[PDB]
């Protein structure tokens, strides 16, 4: 009946033509291979995410608990979700943020110093993948001894969450990584207990819910939740930001002339090349969009990239333009919206600005070497490589 499918080979290569087709001709599009409906329009994605009662987060456990061990923040609700989300935010705000940012500057400059004499650096593989995990470990309070293994294990677990129809051999690997990371972090939670340091794991340890703490297995799951979430989108967004700016030399010069424009450049990057592309929800009762009927138990999948390029929300939506301002403009859905909006949104914007400013400061006369990127992933999406040269 329908011949355009999310799982066509062409979609992962370039999904933009699919975004346009779906929004125009099938805004709630069924994919029988995973028995879910893909939602492409800004208005319907926002509606879904803003109504936690009709579209709930119970679709996560199946795609999480296997590798997470215990409950994840997204599966919580009520006063529990609010208070535990507030606890996590504490680890990237206030005094914790004042202490962390100088350390993230050290991580950034240490990486830069490793590549400066080669006169070129891969924003994805040389900087992004390394900085992202190290920053997430500093946020949690994990010493950087084993950042290599932590990277490997993180990849294996993320693969289980960001993939559809994994084969049995790929599943057992993701779990092995899940077991290894647990074996590593569990004794570290016990020590952070003996002598509490000023990090996120210590926050989770001292958290009181009616004078009742959370079991160490819940701390492990929440710590893993932060580790996976905070790492994945960093290398992607940094690569997209410098690539889009260098593909628009005039806007690159505007950022160099007004450093304050970098925040807007990051926001436009997140809209244009959304690193988190899909958000699933479970339908809790009969419902209808346009004339597509959904039943209790069905699965909807919000297409963040498509929504952020909806011409009903943005004028010239498929063009990168850091000068957007205010329907010709709307709030993008890169961090989601509603109850489960990204707890790390403010930190991410601050973290990403600090990194971009330092790269612009220390790498002079930046030139693009990767003239054409190849992007991979449909759940989380980024460039394979993004190499720049400098003096």
Ligand X SMILES: OB(O)c1cccnc1
Which residues of the shown chain bind ligand HEM in the complex (CB under 6 A)? 73-74, 85, 92, 139, 225-226, 229-230, 233, 237, 270, 275-276, 279, 334-336, 340, 342-344, 347-348
Q: Which does 225 bind (CB under 5 to 8 A by kind): ligand HEM, ligand X, none?
A: ligand HEM
323-342 binders of ligand X (CB under 6 A): 342
Q: Is 23 assigned a ligand-binding role in the annotation?
A: no
63-122 binders of ligand X (CB under 6 A): none
For 180, other C-beta atoms within 10 Å of its C-beta total 16
Interaction between residue 229 and ligand X (CB under 6 A): yes
C-beta closer to ligand HEM: residue 85 or 384: 85
Q: Which does 226 bind (CB under 5 to 8 A by kind): ligand HEM, ligand X, none?
A: ligand HEM
C-beta closer to ligand X: residue 231 or 251: 231
- Stretch touching ligand X by CB under 6 A, among 13-21, 45-53, 148-156, 225-233: 225-233
C-beta closer to ligand X: residue 38 or 252: 38
- Stretch touching ligand X by CB under 6 A, among 16-24, 93-101, 129-137, 226-234: 226-234
Q: Among 143, 139, 144, which Cα is nearest to 96's? A: 139
Contact between residue 381 and residue 112 where contact means Cβ atoms under 8 Å apart:
no
Among 241, 246, 276, 373, binds ligand X (CB under 6 A): 276
C-beta closer to ligand X: residue 51 or 196: 51
Q: Is 25 assigned a ligand-binding role in the annotation?
A: no
Q: How far apart are CA 156 and CA 175, in angstroms?
A: 8
Shortest distance (Å) from residue 72 CB to ligand HEM: 8
Contacts of residue 14, Cβ cutoff 8 Å, sequence gap at least 6: none
Q: Is 281 assigned a ligand-binding role in the annotation?
A: yes
Interaction between residue 233 and ligand X (CB under 6 A): yes
- Stretch touching ligand X by CB under 6 A, among 81-89, 112-120, 212-220, 228-236: 228-236
For 195, other C-beta atoms within 10 Å of its C-beta total 7
Distances in Å between the Cα of 372 and the Cα atoms of 18, 232, 243, 272, 375 are: 20, 22, 9, 16, 10
Burial class (CB in 10 A: 0-12, 13-18, 19+), 53: exposed
**Phi, psi of 252, deg, nearest 5:** -60, -40
Q: Among 154, 185, 165, 202, which Cα is nearest to 32's? A: 165
C-beta closer to ligand HEM: residue 73 or 368: 73
Q: Which does 348 bind (CB under 5 to 8 A by kind): ligand X, ligand HEM, none?
A: ligand HEM
DSSP annotation of 306: H
Cα dihedral across residues 163, 338, 241, 149: positive or negative = negative
C-beta closer to ligand X: residue 70 or 232: 232
**Phi, psi of 41, deg, nearest 5:** -90, 145
Q: Tokens 């759940």 correspond to what residue?
A: 379
Burial class (CB in 10 A: 0-12, 13-18, 19+), 211: exposed
Binding residues for heme b: 281, 340, 342
Site residues (CB under 6 A) for ligand X?
A: 229, 232-233, 276, 342
């Amino acid at each position: 009946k329908v011949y355009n499918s999310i799982f066509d080979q062409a979609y992962e290569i370039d999904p933009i033509p699919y975004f346009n087709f779906l929004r125009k001709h099938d805004p709630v599009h069924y994919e029988e291979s995973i028995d879910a409906y893909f939602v492409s329009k800004y208005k319907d994605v926002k509606y879904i995410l803003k109504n936690n009662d009709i579209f709930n987060t119970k679709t996560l456990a199946k795609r999480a608990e296997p590798v997470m061990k215990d409950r994840v923040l997204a599966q919580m609700s009520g006063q529990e979700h609010k208070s535990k989300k507030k606890a996590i935010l504490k680890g990237m705000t206030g005094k914790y943020l004042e202490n962390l940012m100088p350390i993230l500057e050290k991580r950034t400059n240490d990486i830069i110093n490793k590549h400066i004499e080669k006169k070129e650096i891969d924003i994805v593989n040389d900087f992004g993948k390394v900085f992202a995990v190290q920053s997430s470990m500093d946020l949690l309070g994990i010493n950087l001894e084993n950042y290599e293994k932590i990277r490997e294990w993180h990849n294996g677990i993320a693969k289980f969450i960001t993939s559809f129809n994994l084969n049995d051999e790929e599943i057992k690997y993701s779990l092995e990584c899940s077991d290894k990371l647990e074996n590593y972090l569990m004794p570290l939670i016990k020590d952070r207990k003996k002598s509490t340091k000023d990090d996120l794991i210590s926050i989770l340890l001292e958290y009181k819910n009616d004078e009742n703490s959370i079991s160490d297995t819940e701390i492990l799951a929440l710590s893993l939740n932060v580790l996976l979430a905070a790492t994945e989108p960093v290398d992607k967004t940094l690569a997209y930001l410098f690539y889009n700016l260098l593909k628009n030399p005039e806007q690159f010069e505007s950022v160099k002339n007004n450093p304050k424009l970098i925040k807007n450049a990051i926001i436009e990057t997140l809209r244009y090349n959304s690193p988190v592309q899909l958000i699933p929800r479970q339908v809790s009762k009969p419902f209808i969009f346009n004339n597509t009927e959904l039943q209790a138990g069905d699965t909807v999948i919000c297409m963040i990239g498509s929504a952020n390029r909806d011409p009903e929300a943005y004028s010239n939506p498929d063009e990168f333009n850091i000068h957007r301002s205010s329907t010709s403009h709307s709030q993008n859905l890169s961090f989601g919206t509603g109850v489960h909006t990204c707890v790390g949104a403010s930190f991410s914007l601050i973290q990403l600005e600090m990194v971009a400013i330092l790269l612009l400061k220390r790498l002079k006369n930046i030139k693009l070497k990767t003239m054409e990127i190849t992007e991979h992933g449909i759940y989380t999406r980024g460039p394979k490589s993004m190499v720049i040269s400098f003096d």
